[PDB]
From a paper:
Tethered to the scaffold’s interior are the UBR box, the WD40 repeat and two DOC-homologous β-sandwich domains of each UBR4 subunit. Their lower local resolution indicates that these modules are flexibly attached to the scaffold. The WD40 repeats reside symmetrically on either side of the ring, where they are supported by a helix protruding from the scaffold. The DOC1 domains are positioned near each β-propeller and engage the UBR box of UBR4 and the N-terminal region of KCMF1 to form a three-component subcomplex, referred to as the KCMF1 module, that fits well into the local ~16 Å map. Indicative of its inherent flexibility, 3D classification analyses indicated that this subcomplex can adopt distinct positions on SIFI. The DOC2 domains reside next to the KCMF1 module, where they combine a β-sandwich characteristic of DOC domains with two exposed Zn2+-coordinating loops to form a potential protein-binding interface. The N-terminal, RING-like domains of its two KCMF1 subunits are located at the centre of this structure, while two additional ubiquitylation modules reside within the peripheral UBR4 arms. With four catalytic modules and a dynamic architecture, SIFI appears to be optimally configured to process many substrates for efficient stress response silencing.
Author numbering:
A (entry chain A): 3901 to 4038, 4044 to 4319, 4324 to 4328
B (entry chain B): 3259 to 3337, 3385 to 3544
C (entry chain B): 3758 to 3857, 3866 to 3971
D (entry chain E): 287 to 332
E (entry chain C): 5 to 148
F (entry chain A): 3473 to 3544
G (entry chain F): 287 to 331
The structure:
């Protein structure tokens, strides 16, 4: 490394020779940087500069494929190894990922953002344990309401934010114990001590004598959705889905990512069939009626109803155009109706939202019945699902029914056939 | 008053009569030109009908319009003074009758939506002679109408070729003010920027670029909602 | 995904030594056998399989469009017949109402065709000196350099180069800008020629 | 087969059970750190 | 408390109203609170779930849940329990909390801090500098 | 390689051996980079899979002439 | 043939005899300037 072997291998031997020779050169570089801050730092910085200049040219150079390609397979081989310098490698990976996601160009996505997402996915989802009887992926447990790690500071090499400092910040998991001990008093005691110790730290931080933790809050328009709808490649969407599913380990983080996804719900209608992976992720995360009820409480049902109404109105305003046939016509509609049916399949949500969903289901079914030329198999399945949901909602107390009849009157008010 | 489409036999009789008129106009042009200068309704009504016919009848109607509008000196050259005076009188009569809406309509219908390069060339010749034989005001108005259609070009793809031709020629043939020159240039560069961004950010732009680099191919076989323009060709009749 | 994958391998440009497979059912000549396997695999997958599937899909789409048009015409006739005692003098919307020949959006093909039409129109406009100066002031040179120099058919590339040359005619500011762009790109490609041999792809064009 | 070449035979896998547990804990902690890193990346800049 | 709020409350309470084995109702209500817009720490959740054991499956009524939230609500401040805190934080039957019992509380929570960190914490809490903290100074911090 | 990593050796000669190896690597890399038809071989390796380099002056008796295999 | 397209037909070659002589003189002078430029490039520092 002191000789300068890393730079020679990077400049000359990375791209020339047989593919086996190229992979041997990449392994040699990974070995040279193994447990060597100096060497690892140098190689990571080279990769950063190269990818950054190619992103500054992506718009003028469509050959990005061959360039960033070999340098990013090197990152992926370097991060695949497990040395004590994983921190700098992960830093390079995250930086390149963010830069390339800020770019929508497929060439840029499929190369840089895809390998960066794969690196992040192999880091977040470690290989299945060999010892410890293959224990579940879940020594430190995160704060319920706070993110004790920082990204802007960590990328800037700040010693305040680092794996050592972060891991020092959180408490050890230790052993809860109290298997046969109710410890009812001890529970209240620990509640009080935890609450006011967190208060102690929070006040110490607002005075400015301690690092400020981060609040578990998202903007609802982040790179999450950026990788979530990439029509560029399905691999990036699948990697993002895996990353979000693994971010959903903690129930509070489950709530936050569920809010993020139910916000991204509109992008499903926008992107059509490209959102299949996001849809699978979203239905998987809410497979428990617990989170279905949580989202219903937040108001997901009116949101999905409005989205279904808007999609059906777009189809109605679209049948006035040519007979242009679209293969993925109704995927968004079918998926939104499937989500609504999945939520309704829980009794309590049905009870509380029959009177509010009857109107939108009636309007949607009536507007779908008008479709003749644009009627697609998916549209037919959506109309059948809406009919089943309506029949499921007609059933109720005479009061609820008469209320549904009052809705029917308003629906007719909103043509000798449709009424 | 009635929409849908016309009966096939109605089109048959229409085509018999219009072929008779086309035969008269081709062999004897001045006769047709003077008949239509005696009857301007004939000239404007033929175009207006060419709206409500099938693409089968369109070639003959456009041929009649070109024979009246651009005589047959140029028509044969493409394949005395009083004759060209009749041509100018006929184009002036058409411009007196043809409002900008109908002008816009047939200009997009035959130059842009024809789908038959032969009809598109007929419309190209017809509009070129319309503009040439028109005076300054109608020239500026026609140029403005085509520059108004210019933003809608991305919906017609390759078909637009002939259209663009006329546009360019007219844009450099009519003495025009600096303001509208800048406006036309801005429209052209804006369409170019939009198409460039579309191609750059296109989901499978990388795939098409690499395949064009390596493998010889004619059409883009991996395309959602295949364009009714790129995919649909002008199927040729054959013995 | 298969094309996505084969393209990745071809981009690696690995000199995998010729693999003389025992199976010789296919008539592969020495030169064709020596062609990169992934290249041949790409050519078969796209020009063969993707083209066959796309042709089948386009035939089905055209037949579906014809069926939809016939059904719409029948419905129009029925509603017109049922609209007795009510007549609307349609004009000249007959076209808009029944004919309803248009390129779908996000169509790389006809999008590139519109780009070619833009290049032709700009080559026409650039002839007029005032229009040429206006287009240069717009920023046409940089757009053509960044995007249209390397994409499209070779005839389109040469037309773009001619258009830029026209834009920079008798225009010291214009020629200066294009020269600066070329110098920058060439110097960047000379800063990694040994590091990365992608210099031939762009520097040649510049 | 491939055992003629001494250099290729060099690679020796060896990994112990308690060090297995420690390494698996390290993997889990690194995964948690990356999760917090991405979540802090998503945090709104408000 | 405005009706607008008691209303949101009943609303969600209802939406989650479900029965089953163990103490689901307690879990359902903890999810209600988080859904309402207030996320308690795992410890707070466990405490409240225990603080309600009237009937099988932790039977909770809307009035009962109102009583539960009325105690802490937004958990902005609780002098009566900052007092309860000083009672717990200060151990060894003293009148002033010390670094020793402070680190004892930290370990009971599961947090390991170097004595140096414990000294920083106690220097921050102490105001006069007597080396000890009365309710006065505990309050100091918890309120600041 | 084996011997270089099997014999306990002094730091001075370790550095000498490393310098020799990297010097040979640098010399070969410069030779390949500046080789008259390096561009041709790189591009052909990219496009057409080729076993040997058919356009070579003074074909080294070692490369072009390999051990002929004895056969029945 | 290719005369249908007006835009392609646009290119008009036209070049006059005295302006031929002037342009040829300009070419010769430009060639001489480039010769002097390269010779001054070769000059020993
Ligand atoms: Ca004490
Ligand atoms: Ca004190
Ligand atoms: Zn198209």
């Amino acid at each position: 490394v002191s000789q300068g072997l890393i730079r020679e291998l990077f400049d000359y031997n990375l791209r020339r020779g047989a593919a086996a020779m190229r992979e041997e050169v990449r392994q040699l570089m990974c070995l040279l940087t193994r447990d060597n801050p100096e060497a690892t730092q140098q190689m990571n910085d080279l990769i950063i500069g190269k990818v950054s200049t190619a992103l500054k040219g992506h718009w003028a150079n469509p050959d990005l494929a061959s360039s960033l390609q070999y340098e990013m397979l090197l990152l992926t081989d370097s991060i695949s190894k497990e040395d004590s310098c994983w921190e700098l490698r992960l830093r390079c990976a995250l930086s390149l990922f963010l830069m390339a996601v800020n770019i929508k160009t497929p060439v840029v996505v499929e190369n840089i953002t895809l390998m960066c997402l794969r690196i992040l996915q192999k880091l977040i989802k470690p290989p299945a344990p060999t010892s410890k009887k293959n224990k579940d992926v879940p020594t430190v447990k995160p704060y319920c309401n706070e993110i004790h790690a920082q990204a802007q500071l960590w990328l800037k090499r700040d010693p305040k934010a680092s794996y050592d400092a972060w891991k020092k910040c959180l408490p050890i998991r230790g052993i809860d114990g109290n298997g046969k001990a109710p410890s009812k008093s001890e529970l209240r005691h620990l509640y009080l001590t935890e609450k006011y110790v967190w208060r102690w730290k929070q006040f110490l931080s607002r005075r400015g004598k301690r690092t400020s933790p981060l609040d578990l809050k998202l903007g609802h328009n982040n790179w999450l959705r950026q990788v979530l709808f990439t029509p560029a490649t399905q691999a990036a969407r699948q990697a993002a889905c895996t990353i979000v599913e693994a971010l959903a380990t903690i129930p509070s983080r489950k709530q936050q990512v569920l809010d993020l996804l139910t916000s991204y719900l509109d992008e499903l209608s926008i992107a059509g069939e490209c959102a299949a992976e996001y849809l699978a992720l979203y239905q998987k995360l809410i497979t428990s009626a617990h989170w279905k009820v949580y989202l219903a409480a937040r108001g997901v049902l009116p949101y999905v109803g409005n989205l279904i109404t808007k999609e059906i109105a777009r189809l109605l305003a679209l049948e006035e155009a040519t007979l242009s046939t679209d293969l993925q016509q109704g995927y968004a509609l079918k998926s939104l109706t499937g989500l609504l049916s999945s939520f309704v399949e829980v009794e309590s949500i049905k009870r509380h939202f029959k009177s509010r969903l009857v109107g939108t289901v009636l309007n949607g079914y009536l507007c779908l019945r008008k479709l003749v030329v644009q009627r697609t198999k998916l549209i037919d399945e959506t109309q059948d699902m809406l009919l089943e949901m309506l029949e499921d909602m007609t059933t109720g107390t005479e009061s609820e029914t008469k209320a549904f009849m009052a809705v029917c009157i308003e629906t007719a008010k909103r043509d000798y056939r449709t009424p | 008053s009635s929409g849908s489409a016309l009966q096939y036999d109605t089109l048959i009789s229409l085509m018999e009569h219009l072929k008779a008129c086309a035969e008269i106009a081709a062999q004897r042009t001045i006769n047709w030109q003077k008949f239509c200068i005696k009857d301007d309704s004939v000239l404007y009504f033929l175009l207006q009908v060419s709206f409500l016919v099938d693409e089968g009848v369109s070639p003959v109607l456009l041929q009649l319009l070109s024979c009246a509008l651009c005589g047959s000196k140029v028509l044969a050259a493409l394949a005395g003074s009083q004759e060209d005076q009749l041509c100018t009188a006929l184009v002036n009569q058409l411009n007196k009758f043809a409002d900008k809406e109908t002008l816009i309509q047939f200009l997009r219908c035959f130059l842009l939506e024809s789908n038959s390069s032969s009809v598109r060339w007929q419309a190209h010749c017809l509009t070129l002679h319309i503009y040439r034989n028109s005076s300054k005001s109608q020239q500026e108005l026609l140029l403005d109408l085509m520059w108004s259609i210019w933003p809608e070009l991305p919906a017609y793809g390759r078909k637009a070729a002939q259209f663009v031709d006329l546009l360019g020629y007219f844009s450099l043939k009519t003495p025009q003010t600096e303001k509208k020159l800048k406006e036309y240039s801005q429209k052209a560069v804006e369409i170019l920027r939009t198409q460039n961004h579309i191609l750059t950010n296109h989901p499978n732009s990388n795939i098409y670029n690499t395949l064009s680099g390596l493998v010889e191919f004619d059409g883009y076989y991996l395309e959602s909602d295949p364009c009714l323009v790129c995919n649909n060709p002008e199927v040729p009749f054959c013995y | 995904p298969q094309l996505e994958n084969l393209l990745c391998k071809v981009n690696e440009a690995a000199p995998e030594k010729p693999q003389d497979d025992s199976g010789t059912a296919g008539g592969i000549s020495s030169t064709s056998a020596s062609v990169n396997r992934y290249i041949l695999q790409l050519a078969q997958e796209y020009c063969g399989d993707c083209k066959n599937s796309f042709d089948e899909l386009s035939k089905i789409i055209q037949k579906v469009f014809a069926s939809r048009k016939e059904l719409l015409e029948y419905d129009l006739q029925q509603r017109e017949a049922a609209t007795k005692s009510s007549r609307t003098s349609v004009q000249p919307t007959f076209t808009a109402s029944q004919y309803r020949h248009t390129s779908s959006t996000k169509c790389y093909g006809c999008a590139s065709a519109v780009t070619e039409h833009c290049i032709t129109l700009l080559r026409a406009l650039a002839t007029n000196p005032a229009l040429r100066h206006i287009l240069v002031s717009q920023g046409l040179i940089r757009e053509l350099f960044d995007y249209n120099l390397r994409r499209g058919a070779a005839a389109m590339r040469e037309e773009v180069r001619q258009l830029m040359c026209l834009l920079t005619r008798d225009n010291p500011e214009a020629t200066q800008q294009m020269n600066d762009l070329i110098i920058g790109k060439v110097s960047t490609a000379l800063k990694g020629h040994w590091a990365n041999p992608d210099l031939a792809s762009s520097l040649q064009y510049e | 087969q491939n055992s003629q070449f001494l250099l290729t035979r060099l690679n020796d896998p060896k990994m112990s059970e308690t060090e297995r547990q420690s390494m698996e804990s390290e993997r889990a902690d690194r995964s948690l750190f990356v999760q917090e890193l991405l979540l802090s990346t998503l945090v709104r800049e408000e | 408390l405005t009706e607008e709020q008691i209303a949101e409350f009943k609303e969600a309470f209802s939406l989650f109203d479900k029965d089953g084995d163990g103490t689901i109702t307690t879990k359902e209500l903890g999810t209600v609170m988080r859904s309402l817009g207030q996320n308690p720490t795992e410890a707070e959740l466990q405490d409240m779930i225990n603080e309600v054991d009237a009937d099988g499956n932790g039977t909770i009524d809307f009035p009962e849940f109102l009583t539960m939230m009325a105690r802490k609500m937004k958990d902005t401040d609780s002098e009566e329990e900052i007092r309860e805190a000083f009672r717990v934080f200060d151990k060894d039957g003293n009148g002033y909390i010390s670094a020793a019992e402070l680190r004892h509380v930290m370990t009971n929570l599961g947090e390991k801090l170097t004595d140096e960190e414990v000294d920083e914490m106690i220097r921050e809490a102490d105001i006069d500098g007597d080396g000890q903290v009365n309710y006065e100074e505990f309050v100091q911090m918890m309120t600041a």
